[PDB]
From Swiss-Prot:
Keywords: Ion transport, Iron, Iron transport, Periplasm, Signal, Transport. Pfam families: Peripla_BP_2. It comes from Escherichia coli (strain K12). Induction: Expression is regulated by iron, via the regulatory protein Fur. Induced by hydroxyurea. Belongs to the bacterial solute-binding protein 8 family. Coiled coil: none annotated. The gene is fepB. GO terms for biological process: DNA damage response; ferric-enterobactin import into cell; iron import into cell. The lineage of its organism: Bacteria, Pseudomonadati, Pseudomonadota, Gammaproteobacteria, Enterobacterales. This is Ferric enterobactin-binding periplasmic protein FepB.
Amino acid sequence: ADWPRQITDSRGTHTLESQPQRIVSTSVTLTGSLLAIDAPVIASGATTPNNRVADDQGFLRQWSKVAKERKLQRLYIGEPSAEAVAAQMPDLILISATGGDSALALYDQLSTIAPTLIINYDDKSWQSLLTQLGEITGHEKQAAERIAQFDKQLAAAKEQIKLPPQPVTAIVYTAAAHSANLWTPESAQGQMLEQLGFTLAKLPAGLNASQSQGKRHDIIQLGGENLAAGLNGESLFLFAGDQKDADAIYANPLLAHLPAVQNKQVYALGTETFRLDYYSAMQVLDRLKALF
C-alpha cells in the first residue's frame, strides 16, 4: 500500500493522506495532462462537452468513474454547488485562486466533503504541470518516456518552421459569451506557444488596472478602449474562431481602426481548439504546420 506523501501547492504547505482515487478539477490544462499521465478526472472545465461522452476515446477508466456517481459530465466555471460536489463523493478537490466562484465560501463546504486543495488557475504550463503529476511513484520513468518523445517532436518541429522577425501575442475577445482574456508569457498558453517557436510580449503594467480594479496578477484581463494603443497588434491569436470569427470581429468600429486588421495580421488557433491543454498543443502544432 502507499503511504502519505508531501505534495507542493500554492498555499504554503499541503500534504496527501493517500493516493486519491477520485479527483475533481475545473482546469482544462490539468484535465488533459491528467489523461496523458493516465489519471482522468471526474469533473473538468469546458464548453458544451460531447467528445468525452464519445466512445472509448482511449480511456476506459472514465466510463466507471463517471458512471460510479451520476455520469456527471464536464463542468464549466460558473456552476458552483455544494450538493452536486457531495453527490460525487470526491477525494481530491482543486480550487482556483480567484474567480467568479468564491473559494472561502466553498472551502468549508469542500473541505468537509473532502480534502480541499488550493491551486492557482493556469500557473503552470504542460511542462511544469506535467512534471508535477509525474511526481507520483512509478510515473517518472513513464513521464520521461512521453516527455522525451514529445520534446523530440517539438524540437524538430521548431527547426521545421520559423516565424518572421517580430513579436507576437495571443488574446481572446468574444462578445457572445461577453468576456475576453489576454494571454501572456507567464500564462500556460504563452509558454506553450513559446516552446513551439513564438515570441510573447508582456502587456503594460499601467493599463493592467485599466479595467479590472482588483487583483489579477495571475492573468491580465482587460477590455477598455486602452487596448487599442496597448497591444501593438503584430499577430493576435484567437481561440475557437477561425478566419471566420476574425473576419466578423473586424466589425468592432472602435477596434476596426486596428492596424493589425488593416494589414491582416490576425490568426486563429482553430475552431474546435476551444480546450487548451497538452493535447491542444498537438492540435495547435498541426494547425501551425498547415497554416504555413
